[PDB]
Amino acid sequence: GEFEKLEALEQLQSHIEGWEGSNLTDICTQLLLQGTLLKISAGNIQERAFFLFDNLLVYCKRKINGSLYIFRGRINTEVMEVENVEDGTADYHSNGYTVTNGWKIHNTAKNKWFVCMAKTAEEKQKWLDAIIREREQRESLKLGMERDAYV
């Protein structure tokens, strides 16, 4: 049930070194998707492990020692926007490199944009679908609660 998932979250976080901020078991309940993506941010091109939880996106550098990942950043999905990027696009957001299977993420709390690229079109679609699902679940929960408070 819910409790075994929380234990799983604590275990997952134990594989991430240098964690910043609140713990996964305090704000999340599930993992929608994990995978490797190319991240282009502020002139830097870096491969990262991305984790999309309910309410939270985490990205890490890939690394008895249980550490597999090095914490690099997190975004509250409530303040995250996503914008499609069409294949063949090349501008300063991608350092002038041609983007394929890519998209942009806006961290609105830090007013910061960065580009993500997957290796395949199917993997890109999997990410876009998971981002949509995360947002839909979160909005459904929130609207339900507000409906309860309002009526």
Side-chain angles (χ1 to χ4, degrees), residues 31-72:
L31 178 68
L32 286 97
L33 188 59
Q34 75 183 323
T36 306
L37 300 168
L38 190 62
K39 170 173 164 292
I40 307 182
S41 184
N44 294 336
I45 300 186
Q46 304 162 310
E47 192 167 64
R48 296 285 181 260
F50 280 78
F51 302 82
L52 177 65
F53 308 90
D54 58 322
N55 310 306
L56 189 70
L57 180 75
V58 178
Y59 50 89
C60 305
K61 180 167 44 168
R62 301 205 289 316
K63 172 145 181 150
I64 294 291
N65 193 317
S67 303
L68 297 177
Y69 313 104
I70 301 162
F71 181 95
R72 293 307 294 161

mmCIF file of all heavy atoms in Angstrom, residues 31-72:
data_model
loop_
_atom_site.group_PDB
_atom_site.id
_atom_site.type_symbol
_atom_site.label_atom_id
_atom_site.label_comp_id
_atom_site.label_asym_id
_atom_site.label_seq_id
_atom_site.Cartn_x
_atom_site.Cartn_y
_atom_site.Cartn_z
ATOM 1 N N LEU A 31 6.695 7.501 -7.963
ATOM 2 C CA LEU A 31 7.617 7.864 -9.036
ATOM 3 C C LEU A 31 6.938 7.583 -10.360
ATOM 4 O O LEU A 31 6.647 6.430 -10.678
ATOM 5 C CB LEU A 31 8.932 7.073 -8.925
ATOM 6 C CG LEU A 31 9.996 7.297 -10.003
ATOM 7 C CD1 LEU A 31 10.559 8.699 -9.886
ATOM 8 C CD2 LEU A 31 11.101 6.249 -9.876
ATOM 9 N N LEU A 32 6.666 8.634 -11.123
ATOM 10 C CA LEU A 32 6.051 8.471 -12.433
ATOM 11 C C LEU A 32 7.030 7.967 -13.484
ATOM 12 O O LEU A 32 6.663 7.153 -14.344
ATOM 13 C CB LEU A 32 5.436 9.789 -12.899
ATOM 14 C CG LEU A 32 4.134 10.135 -12.171
ATOM 15 C CD1 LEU A 32 4.393 11.100 -11.007
ATOM 16 C CD2 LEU A 32 3.097 10.681 -13.146
ATOM 17 N N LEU A 33 8.266 8.454 -13.425
ATOM 18 C CA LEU A 33 9.254 8.132 -14.451
ATOM 19 C C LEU A 33 10.670 8.490 -14.028
ATOM 20 O O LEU A 33 10.890 9.509 -13.382
ATOM 21 C CB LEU A 33 8.920 8.871 -15.742
ATOM 22 C CG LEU A 33 9.733 8.530 -16.985
ATOM 23 C CD1 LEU A 33 9.603 7.059 -17.310
ATOM 24 C CD2 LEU A 33 9.242 9.381 -18.156
ATOM 25 N N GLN A 34 11.626 7.655 -14.410
ATOM 26 C CA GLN A 34 13.032 8.003 -14.284
ATOM 27 C C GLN A 34 13.732 7.699 -15.601
ATOM 28 O O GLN A 34 13.319 6.813 -16.355
ATOM 29 C CB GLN A 34 13.694 7.245 -13.126
ATOM 30 C CG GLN A 34 13.969 5.796 -13.431
ATOM 31 C CD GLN A 34 14.563 5.046 -12.254
ATOM 32 O OE1 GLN A 34 15.365 5.585 -11.502
ATOM 33 N NE2 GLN A 34 14.197 3.784 -12.116
ATOM 34 N N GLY A 35 14.784 8.442 -15.898
ATOM 35 C CA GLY A 35 15.544 8.176 -17.108
ATOM 36 C C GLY A 35 16.680 9.150 -17.299
ATOM 37 O O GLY A 35 16.732 10.186 -16.653
ATOM 38 N N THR A 36 17.593 8.811 -18.203
ATOM 39 C CA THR A 36 18.702 9.692 -18.519
ATOM 40 C C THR A 36 18.322 10.647 -19.643
ATOM 41 O O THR A 36 17.704 10.244 -20.631
ATOM 42 C CB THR A 36 19.954 8.881 -18.918
ATOM 43 O OG1 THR A 36 20.253 7.931 -17.889
ATOM 44 C CG2 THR A 36 21.118 9.797 -19.065
ATOM 45 N N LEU A 37 18.664 11.921 -19.477
ATOM 46 C CA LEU A 37 18.432 12.934 -20.509
ATOM 47 C C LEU A 37 19.643 13.833 -20.635
ATOM 48 O O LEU A 37 20.389 14.001 -19.672
ATOM 49 C CB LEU A 37 17.210 13.796 -20.181
ATOM 50 C CG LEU A 37 15.874 13.057 -20.056
ATOM 51 C CD1 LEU A 37 14.837 13.989 -19.447
ATOM 52 C CD2 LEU A 37 15.393 12.563 -21.422
ATOM 53 N N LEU A 38 19.823 14.415 -21.813
ATOM 54 C CA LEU A 38 20.832 15.456 -21.994
ATOM 55 C C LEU A 38 20.238 16.788 -21.547
ATOM 56 O O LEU A 38 19.190 17.174 -22.020
ATOM 57 C CB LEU A 38 21.280 15.523 -23.458
ATOM 58 C CG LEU A 38 22.503 16.395 -23.755
ATOM 59 C CD1 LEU A 38 23.713 15.857 -23.009
ATOM 60 C CD2 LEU A 38 22.770 16.422 -25.252
ATOM 61 N N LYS A 39 20.899 17.482 -20.633
ATOM 62 C CA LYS A 39 20.399 18.750 -20.119
ATOM 63 C C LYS A 39 21.329 19.872 -20.551
ATOM 64 O O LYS A 39 22.536 19.800 -20.321
ATOM 65 C CB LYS A 39 20.283 18.701 -18.595
ATOM 66 C CG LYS A 39 19.995 20.049 -17.918
ATOM 67 C CD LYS A 39 19.736 19.844 -16.422
ATOM 68 C CE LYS A 39 19.830 21.157 -15.641
ATOM 69 N NZ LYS A 39 21.241 21.657 -15.621
ATOM 70 N N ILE A 40 20.764 20.886 -21.195
ATOM 71 C CA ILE A 40 21.522 22.059 -21.626
ATOM 72 C C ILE A 40 21.010 23.264 -20.861
ATOM 73 O O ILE A 40 19.858 23.669 -21.014
ATOM 74 C CB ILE A 40 21.400 22.296 -23.155
ATOM 75 C CG1 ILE A 40 21.768 21.014 -23.917
ATOM 76 C CG2 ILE A 40 22.299 23.451 -23.603
ATOM 77 C CD1 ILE A 40 21.718 21.159 -25.421
ATOM 78 N N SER A 41 21.864 23.829 -20.017
ATOM 79 C CA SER A 41 21.441 24.913 -19.136
ATOM 80 C C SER A 41 22.552 25.934 -19.011
ATOM 81 O O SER A 41 23.688 25.571 -18.722
ATOM 82 C CB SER A 41 21.062 24.368 -17.754
ATOM 83 O OG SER A 41 20.552 25.393 -16.908
ATOM 84 N N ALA A 42 22.228 27.200 -19.260
ATOM 85 C CA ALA A 42 23.175 28.311 -19.081
ATOM 86 C C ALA A 42 24.568 28.049 -19.674
ATOM 87 O O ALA A 42 25.585 28.307 -19.026
ATOM 88 C CB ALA A 42 23.298 28.647 -17.603
ATOM 89 N N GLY A 43 24.611 27.533 -20.896
ATOM 90 C CA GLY A 43 25.875 27.289 -21.564
ATOM 91 C C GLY A 43 26.531 25.949 -21.276
ATOM 92 O O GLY A 43 27.562 25.628 -21.864
ATOM 93 N N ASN A 44 25.947 25.163 -20.375
ATOM 94 C CA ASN A 44 26.515 23.861 -20.028
ATOM 95 C C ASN A 44 25.721 22.704 -20.634
ATOM 96 O O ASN A 44 24.497 22.689 -20.575
ATOM 97 C CB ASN A 44 26.583 23.688 -18.515
ATOM 98 C CG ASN A 44 27.543 24.659 -17.863
ATOM 99 O OD1 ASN A 44 28.474 25.147 -18.501
ATOM 100 N ND2 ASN A 44 27.309 24.963 -16.593
ATOM 101 N N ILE A 45 26.422 21.735 -21.207
ATOM 102 C CA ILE A 45 25.764 20.542 -21.732
ATOM 103 C C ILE A 45 26.169 19.335 -20.900
ATOM 104 O O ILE A 45 27.334 18.941 -20.874
ATOM 105 C CB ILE A 45 26.108 20.320 -23.207
ATOM 106 C CG1 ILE A 45 25.639 21.524 -24.023
ATOM 107 C CG2 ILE A 45 25.454 19.045 -23.732
ATOM 108 C CD1 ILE A 45 25.793 21.338 -25.501
ATOM 109 N N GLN A 46 25.194 18.758 -20.205
ATOM 110 C CA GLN A 46 25.456 17.730 -19.208
ATOM 111 C C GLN A 46 24.397 16.623 -19.251
ATOM 112 O O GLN A 46 23.206 16.903 -19.221
ATOM 113 C CB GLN A 46 25.497 18.367 -17.807
ATOM 114 C CG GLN A 46 26.506 19.523 -17.663
ATOM 115 C CD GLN A 46 26.250 20.430 -16.461
ATOM 116 O OE1 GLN A 46 25.133 20.900 -16.243
ATOM 117 N NE2 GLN A 46 27.300 20.689 -15.680
ATOM 118 N N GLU A 47 24.836 15.370 -19.284
ATOM 119 C CA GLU A 47 23.929 14.246 -19.121
ATOM 120 C C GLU A 47 23.510 14.098 -17.652
ATOM 121 O O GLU A 47 24.342 14.183 -16.747
ATOM 122 C CB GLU A 47 24.597 12.967 -19.631
ATOM 123 C CG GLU A 47 23.662 11.824 -19.771
ATOM 124 C CD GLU A 47 24.261 10.678 -20.557
ATOM 125 O OE1 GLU A 47 25.250 10.085 -20.086
ATOM 126 O OE2 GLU A 47 23.735 10.378 -21.647
ATOM 127 N N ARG A 48 22.216 13.883 -17.418
ATOM 128 C CA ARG A 48 21.657 13.813 -16.069
ATOM 129 C C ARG A 48 20.616 12.706 -15.961
ATOM 130 O O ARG A 48 19.921 12.405 -16.928
ATOM 131 C CB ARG A 48 21.003 15.154 -15.677
ATOM 132 C CG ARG A 48 21.975 16.338 -15.585
ATOM 133 C CD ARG A 48 22.802 16.225 -14.321
ATOM 134 N NE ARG A 48 23.746 17.323 -14.132
ATOM 135 C CZ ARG A 48 25.047 17.250 -14.407
ATOM 136 N NH1 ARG A 48 25.559 16.141 -14.916
ATOM 137 N NH2 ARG A 48 25.837 18.295 -14.171
ATOM 138 N N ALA A 49 20.545 12.097 -14.784
ATOM 139 C CA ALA A 49 19.467 11.204 -14.398
ATOM 140 C C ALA A 49 18.314 12.048 -13.868
ATOM 141 O O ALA A 49 18.492 12.781 -12.906
ATOM 142 C CB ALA A 49 19.936 10.221 -13.340
ATOM 143 N N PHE A 50 17.140 11.933 -14.487
ATOM 144 C CA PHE A 50 15.958 12.691 -14.067
ATOM 145 C C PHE A 50 14.954 11.759 -13.390
ATOM 146 O O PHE A 50 14.792 10.600 -13.800
ATOM 147 C CB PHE A 50 15.268 13.370 -15.266
ATOM 148 C CG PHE A 50 15.914 14.654 -15.718
ATOM 149 C CD1 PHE A 50 17.072 14.640 -16.483
ATOM 150 C CD2 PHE A 50 15.324 15.873 -15.423
ATOM 151 C CE1 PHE A 50 17.648 15.816 -16.925
ATOM 152 C CE2 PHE A 50 15.905 17.070 -15.848
ATOM 153 C CZ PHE A 50 17.069 17.039 -16.605
ATOM 154 N N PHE A 51 14.294 12.277 -12.362
ATOM 155 C CA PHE A 51 13.288 11.553 -11.599
ATOM 156 C C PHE A 51 12.059 12.436 -11.488
ATOM 157 O O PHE A 51 12.151 13.533 -10.948
ATOM 158 C CB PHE A 51 13.786 11.208 -10.193
ATOM 159 C CG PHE A 51 15.045 10.390 -10.165
ATOM 160 C CD1 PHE A 51 16.287 11.002 -10.312
ATOM 161 C CD2 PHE A 51 14.990 9.022 -9.962
ATOM 162 C CE1 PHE A 51 17.455 10.250 -10.286
ATOM 163 C CE2 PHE A 51 16.153 8.263 -9.924
ATOM 164 C CZ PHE A 51 17.387 8.879 -10.091
ATOM 165 N N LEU A 52 10.915 11.965 -11.980
ATOM 166 C CA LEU A 52 9.691 12.738 -11.836
ATOM 167 C C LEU A 52 8.783 12.058 -10.842
ATOM 168 O O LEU A 52 8.242 10.994 -11.120
ATOM 169 C CB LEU A 52 8.965 12.899 -13.172
ATOM 170 C CG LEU A 52 7.619 13.630 -13.123
ATOM 171 C CD1 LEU A 52 7.799 15.081 -12.707
ATOM 172 C CD2 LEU A 52 6.917 13.510 -14.499
ATOM 173 N N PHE A 53 8.641 12.680 -9.681
ATOM 174 C CA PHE A 53 7.703 12.263 -8.637
ATOM 175 C C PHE A 53 6.446 13.106 -8.684
ATOM 176 O O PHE A 53 6.426 14.203 -9.272
ATOM 177 C CB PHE A 53 8.318 12.421 -7.240
ATOM 178 C CG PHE A 53 9.659 11.778 -7.082
ATOM 179 C CD1 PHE A 53 10.821 12.494 -7.357
ATOM 180 C CD2 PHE A 53 9.764 10.456 -6.661
ATOM 181 C CE1 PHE A 53 12.075 11.899 -7.216
ATOM 182 C CE2 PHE A 53 11.016 9.864 -6.506
ATOM 183 C CZ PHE A 53 12.169 10.593 -6.785
ATOM 184 N N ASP A 54 5.413 12.656 -7.983
ATOM 185 C CA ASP A 54 4.316 13.575 -7.751
ATOM 186 C C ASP A 54 4.885 14.757 -6.954
ATOM 187 O O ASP A 54 5.574 14.572 -5.955
ATOM 188 C CB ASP A 54 3.123 12.894 -7.048
ATOM 189 C CG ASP A 54 3.478 12.263 -5.715
ATOM 190 O OD1 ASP A 54 4.576 11.693 -5.582
ATOM 191 O OD2 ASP A 54 2.629 12.321 -4.791
ATOM 192 N N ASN A 55 4.644 15.960 -7.474
ATOM 193 C CA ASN A 55 5.034 17.236 -6.873
ATOM 194 C C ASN A 55 6.496 17.624 -7.049
ATOM 195 O O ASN A 55 6.881 18.734 -6.636
ATOM 196 C CB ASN A 55 4.696 17.268 -5.366
ATOM 197 C CG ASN A 55 3.263 16.856 -5.085
ATOM 198 O OD1 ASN A 55 2.333 17.414 -5.653
ATOM 199 N ND2 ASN A 55 3.085 15.858 -4.231
ATOM 200 N N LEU A 56 7.324 16.762 -7.646
ATOM 201 C CA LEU A 56 8.752 17.107 -7.642
ATOM 202 C C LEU A 56 9.547 16.502 -8.800
ATOM 203 O O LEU A 56 9.412 15.331 -9.085
ATOM 204 C CB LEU A 56 9.408 16.661 -6.324
ATOM 205 C CG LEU A 56 10.850 17.107 -6.041
ATOM 206 C CD1 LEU A 56 10.895 18.601 -5.769
ATOM 207 C CD2 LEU A 56 11.447 16.326 -4.865
ATOM 208 N N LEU A 57 10.386 17.312 -9.433
ATOM 209 C CA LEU A 57 11.338 16.820 -10.429
ATOM 210 C C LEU A 57 12.739 16.932 -9.848
ATOM 211 O O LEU A 57 13.112 17.976 -9.334
ATOM 212 C CB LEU A 57 11.241 17.622 -11.732
ATOM 213 C CG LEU A 57 12.202 17.160 -12.836
ATOM 214 C CD1 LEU A 57 11.692 15.858 -13.465
ATOM 215 C CD2 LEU A 57 12.370 18.236 -13.877
ATOM 216 N N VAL A 58 13.511 15.857 -9.915
ATOM 217 C CA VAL A 58 14.875 15.866 -9.410
ATOM 218 C C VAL A 58 15.810 15.500 -10.555
ATOM 219 O O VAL A 58 15.473 14.642 -11.371
ATOM 220 C CB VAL A 58 15.050 14.868 -8.243
ATOM 221 C CG1 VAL A 58 16.498 14.850 -7.751
ATOM 222 C CG2 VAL A 58 14.102 15.207 -7.102
ATOM 223 N N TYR A 59 16.959 16.166 -10.648
ATOM 224 C CA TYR A 59 17.980 15.718 -11.585
ATOM 225 C C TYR A 59 19.349 15.620 -10.905
ATOM 226 O O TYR A 59 19.689 16.427 -10.022
ATOM 227 C CB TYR A 59 18.030 16.629 -12.817
ATOM 228 C CG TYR A 59 18.112 18.113 -12.530
ATOM 229 C CD1 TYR A 59 19.339 18.747 -12.380
ATOM 230 C CD2 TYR A 59 16.961 18.883 -12.436
ATOM 231 C CE1 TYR A 59 19.416 20.112 -12.130
ATOM 232 C CE2 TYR A 59 17.025 20.235 -12.180
ATOM 233 C CZ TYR A 59 18.247 20.847 -12.028
ATOM 234 O OH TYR A 59 18.289 22.201 -11.783
ATOM 235 N N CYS A 60 20.101 14.600 -11.325
ATOM 236 C CA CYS A 60 21.351 14.174 -10.695
ATOM 237 C C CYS A 60 22.430 13.833 -11.706
ATOM 238 O O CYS A 60 22.140 13.431 -12.822
ATOM 239 C CB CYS A 60 21.140 12.931 -9.827
ATOM 240 S SG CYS A 60 19.887 13.028 -8.563
ATOM 241 N N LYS A 61 23.685 13.936 -11.283
ATOM 242 C CA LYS A 61 24.790 13.390 -12.058
ATOM 243 C C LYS A 61 24.934 11.918 -11.699
ATOM 244 O O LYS A 61 24.770 11.541 -10.545
ATOM 245 C CB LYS A 61 26.088 14.164 -11.758
ATOM 246 C CG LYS A 61 27.323 13.679 -12.502
ATOM 247 C CD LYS A 61 28.456 14.701 -12.380
ATOM 248 C CE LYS A 61 28.591 15.228 -10.954
ATOM 249 N NZ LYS A 61 29.853 16.004 -10.751
ATOM 250 N N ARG A 62 25.239 11.076 -12.673
ATOM 251 C CA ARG A 62 25.397 9.663 -12.363
ATOM 252 C C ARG A 62 26.787 9.469 -11.751
ATOM 253 O O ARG A 62 27.745 10.109 -12.174
ATOM 254 C CB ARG A 62 25.186 8.817 -13.615
ATOM 255 C CG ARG A 62 23.795 9.029 -14.211
ATOM 256 C CD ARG A 62 23.293 7.845 -15.044
ATOM 257 N NE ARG A 62 23.981 7.663 -16.330
ATOM 258 C CZ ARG A 62 24.295 8.618 -17.211
ATOM 259 N NH1 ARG A 62 23.966 9.893 -17.018
ATOM 260 N NH2 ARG A 62 24.929 8.282 -18.329
ATOM 261 N N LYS A 63 26.890 8.632 -10.725
ATOM 262 C CA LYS A 63 28.137 8.539 -9.956
ATOM 263 C C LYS A 63 29.067 7.453 -10.479
ATOM 264 O O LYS A 63 28.807 6.848 -11.515
ATOM 265 C CB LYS A 63 27.844 8.286 -8.475
ATOM 266 C CG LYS A 63 29.095 7.993 -7.649
ATOM 267 C CD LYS A 63 28.987 8.561 -6.246
ATOM 268 C CE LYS A 63 30.258 8.288 -5.456
ATOM 269 N NZ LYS A 63 30.524 9.346 -4.445
ATOM 270 N N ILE A 64 29.003 -1.414 2.243
ATOM 271 C CA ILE A 64 28.958 -1.237 0.792
ATOM 272 C C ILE A 64 28.261 0.071 0.409
ATOM 273 O O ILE A 64 27.120 0.319 0.813
ATOM 274 C CB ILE A 64 28.233 -2.400 0.094
ATOM 275 C CG1 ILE A 64 29.018 -3.701 0.255
ATOM 276 C CG2 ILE A 64 28.054 -2.095 -1.382
ATOM 277 C CD1 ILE A 64 30.320 -3.717 -0.510
ATOM 278 N N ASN A 65 28.957 0.890 -0.378
ATOM 279 C CA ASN A 65 28.466 2.200 -0.791
ATOM 280 C C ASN A 65 27.196 2.077 -1.622
ATOM 281 O O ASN A 65 27.187 1.396 -2.648
ATOM 282 C CB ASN A 65 29.546 2.938 -1.588
ATOM 283 C CG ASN A 65 29.232 4.413 -1.793
ATOM 284 O OD1 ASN A 65 28.102 4.788 -2.103
ATOM 285 N ND2 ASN A 65 30.241 5.259 -1.617
ATOM 286 N N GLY A 66 26.127 2.729 -1.178
ATOM 287 C CA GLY A 66 24.871 2.673 -1.908
ATOM 288 C C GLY A 66 24.607 3.841 -2.853
ATOM 289 O O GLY A 66 23.531 3.914 -3.448
ATOM 290 N N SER A 67 25.573 4.748 -3.004
ATOM 291 C CA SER A 67 25.349 5.964 -3.800
ATOM 292 C C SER A 67 25.488 5.721 -5.295
ATOM 293 O O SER A 67 26.537 5.286 -5.755
ATOM 294 C CB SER A 67 26.321 7.071 -3.382
ATOM 295 O OG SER A 67 26.207 7.362 -1.997
ATOM 296 N N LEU A 68 24.433 6.014 -6.054
ATOM 297 C CA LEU A 68 24.469 5.878 -7.510
ATOM 298 C C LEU A 68 24.435 7.220 -8.231
ATOM 299 O O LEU A 68 24.794 7.318 -9.415
ATOM 300 C CB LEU A 68 23.278 5.045 -7.999
ATOM 301 C CG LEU A 68 23.191 3.595 -7.549
ATOM 302 C CD1 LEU A 68 21.888 2.985 -8.087
ATOM 303 C CD2 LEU A 68 24.395 2.849 -8.071
ATOM 304 N N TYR A 69 23.954 8.237 -7.526
ATOM 305 C CA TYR A 69 23.688 9.544 -8.114
ATOM 306 C C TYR A 69 24.180 10.666 -7.224
ATOM 307 O O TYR A 69 24.269 10.516 -6.002
ATOM 308 C CB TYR A 69 22.189 9.750 -8.360
ATOM 309 C CG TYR A 69 21.498 8.587 -9.025
ATOM 310 C CD1 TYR A 69 20.685 7.737 -8.289
ATOM 311 C CD2 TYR A 69 21.637 8.355 -10.389
ATOM 312 C CE1 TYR A 69 20.034 6.674 -8.885
ATOM 313 C CE2 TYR A 69 20.981 7.278 -11.001
ATOM 314 C CZ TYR A 69 20.188 6.450 -10.234
ATOM 315 O OH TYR A 69 19.534 5.384 -10.812
ATOM 316 N N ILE A 70 24.488 11.791 -7.856
ATOM 317 C CA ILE A 70 24.910 12.993 -7.143
ATOM 318 C C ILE A 70 23.867 14.067 -7.378
ATOM 319 O O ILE A 70 23.637 14.469 -8.521
ATOM 320 C CB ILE A 70 26.294 13.478 -7.614
ATOM 321 C CG1 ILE A 70 27.336 12.381 -7.388
ATOM 322 C CG2 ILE A 70 26.699 14.770 -6.889
ATOM 323 C CD1 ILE A 70 28.606 12.560 -8.193
ATOM 324 N N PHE A 71 23.220 14.509 -6.305
ATOM 325 C CA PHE A 71 22.156 15.507 -6.411
ATOM 326 C C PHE A 71 22.629 16.763 -7.137
ATOM 327 O O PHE A 71 23.688 17.302 -6.825
ATOM 328 C CB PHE A 71 21.640 15.868 -5.013
ATOM 329 C CG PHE A 71 20.524 16.882 -5.020
ATOM 330 C CD1 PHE A 71 19.203 16.470 -4.996
ATOM 331 C CD2 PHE A 71 20.798 18.248 -5.038
ATOM 332 C CE1 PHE A 71 18.169 17.390 -5.000
ATOM 333 C CE2 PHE A 71 19.767 19.176 -5.043
ATOM 334 C CZ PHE A 71 18.446 18.739 -5.022
ATOM 335 N N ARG A 72 21.854 17.241 -8.104
ATOM 336 C CA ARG A 72 22.219 18.487 -8.776
ATOM 337 C C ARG A 72 21.115 19.533 -8.673
ATOM 338 O O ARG A 72 21.396 20.712 -8.468
ATOM 339 C CB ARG A 72 22.578 18.243 -10.243
ATOM 340 C CG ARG A 72 23.856 17.417 -10.445
ATOM 341 C CD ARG A 72 25.021 18.007 -9.680
ATOM 342 N NE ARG A 72 25.400 19.315 -10.198
ATOM 343 C CZ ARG A 72 26.122 20.202 -9.524
ATOM 344 N NH1 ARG A 72 26.528 19.926 -8.291
ATOM 345 N NH2 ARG A 72 26.426 21.371 -10.073
#
